[PDB]
Amino acid sequence: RLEVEKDELQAALEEAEAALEQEENKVLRSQLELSQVRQEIDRRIQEK
Amino acid sequence: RLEVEKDELQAALEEAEAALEQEENKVLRSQLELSQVRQEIDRRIQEK
C-alpha cells in the first residue's frame, strides 16, 4: 500500500523534470530572437 | 529502509523541484514581457 504511492511520487518527479526542462528550452528562445533582432531592423528599414 | 528514502525523495520533488519550476516561470514570463518591449524597437522604424 506504500509502494503504490512510492511509484507515484517517482513518476511525478519524472513528470516534473520533463516539464521543468521545457522552460529551459523556452528561456533560450526569446534570448535567441533578441540576439538576432539587430539583423532584422536593418533589413526591414531597407524595405521601407 | 523504504520509508526513509520515500520522504527524502519526497522532500525534493514535492517542494524543491516544484518550486524550481515556478522559480523559472518568472524567468519565462519576465523575458516574454521583454520581447514585446523589444517590439518597440520595431516601433522606431515605424516612426521614420
Q: How far is A43 from chain B (nearest CA, A)?
A: 11
The cell numbers describing B47, all together, are 516612426
DSSP A1-48: --HHHHHHHHHHHHHHHHHTHHHHHHHHHHHHHHTTHHHHHHHHHHH-
Q: Are A9 and B11 in contact (CB under 8 A)?
A: no
The cell numbers describing A28, all together, are 533560450
Q: How many angstroms separate the CA atoms of A44 and A42, rounded? A: 6
Q: Say whether A37 and B32 touch across the interface (CB within 8 A).
A: no
Experimental method: cryo-EM
Q: Give the C-alpha distances (Å, rounded to integers) separating A44 from A19, A20, B16, B36.
A: 37, 36, 45, 18
A42 touches chain B (CB under 8 A): no
Q: How many angstroms separate the CA atoms of B18 and B23, rounded? A: 9
> Which of these, A32, A7, A20, lies nearest to B31 by C-alpha position?
A32
Helix residue ranges per DSSP H, B1-48: 2-10, 17-38, 41-47
